[PDB]
Amino acid sequence: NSNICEVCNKWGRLFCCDTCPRSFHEHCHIPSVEANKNPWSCIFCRIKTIQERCPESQSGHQESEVLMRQMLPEEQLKCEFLLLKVYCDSKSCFFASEPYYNREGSQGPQKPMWLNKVKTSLNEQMYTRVEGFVQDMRLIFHNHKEFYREDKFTRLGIQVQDIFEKNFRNIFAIQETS
Ligand SMILES: [Zn+2]
Ligand SMILES: [Zn+2]
Ligand SMILES: [Zn+2]
Numbered sequence: 001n002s003n004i005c006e007v008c009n010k011w012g013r014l015f016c017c018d019t020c021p022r023s024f025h026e027h028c029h030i031p032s033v034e035a036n037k038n039p040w041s042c043i044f045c046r047i048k049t050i051q052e053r054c055p056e057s058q059s060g061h062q063e064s065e066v067l068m069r070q071m072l073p074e075e076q077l078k079c080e081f082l083l084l085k086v087y088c089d090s091k092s093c094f095f096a097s098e099p100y101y102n103r104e105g106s107q108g109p110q111k112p113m114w115l116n117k118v119k120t121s122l123n124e125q126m127y128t129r130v131e132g133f134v135q136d137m138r139l140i141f142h143n144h145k146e147f148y149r150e151d152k153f154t155r156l157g158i159q160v161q162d163i164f165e166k167n168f169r170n171i172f173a174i175q176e177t178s
Helices: 043-053 063-068 072-087 090-096 117-123 130-148 152-170
Strands: 015-017 024-025
Touching: 015 090, 063 130, 072 090, 072 117, 072 130, 072 152, 090 117, 090 130, 090 152, 117 130, 130 152
Parallel strands: none
Antiparallel strands: 015 024
C-alpha cells in the first residue's frame, strides 16, 4: 500500500485499503474509515464495484435526471466520493471551513456554505435528492465568485469548481457534449 494519504498526500496514522494500494487518514476518507471490517475496501473500490455490477450505469445521462434521484445508498456513496475528489485538491483548503466576510466594497453571501458543512450534511443524511448536495456544492463557488468580484482570488473558486464539475460528470456518467 501507499505510505501517504490519497486525499491530503501526508503520512501519519493511515488505514490501508484491502483491494487497492490506497491509504487514508481516518477523517480524510469519506465516510470516515470504519471501526472494524476486515477486509476493508475504500470508496474508490466501492465505486468501481457499482460500475462493474451494472456496466450500463456508465452510459450517458442527463443532468436533470441525475439531480432528481433520491439519495438511496448508491447515490449517497456517489456524492460522498464526489465530495472526496474535491478534498483531494489542495486548493480545497480555501473552501473547507466556515468563511467570514469583511472586505471593503463587498457584502457577504446570504447563505454561506463550505465543504465541512456539506460533509456533516451527508453524514447526517440531510439530503433527500442528489440535487440538494449538488446545489450546496455549487453555492460554495458561486458565493466566492460574487464576494471577491475582480480580485484575482476569484480564480480559486473557478479552479475548484472545475474539479467539482469534471468529477460530477465522471461519477454520475453525464452524457458528453460540446
Ligand atoms: Zn489525509
Ligand atoms: Zn481501494
Ligand atoms: Zn446489470
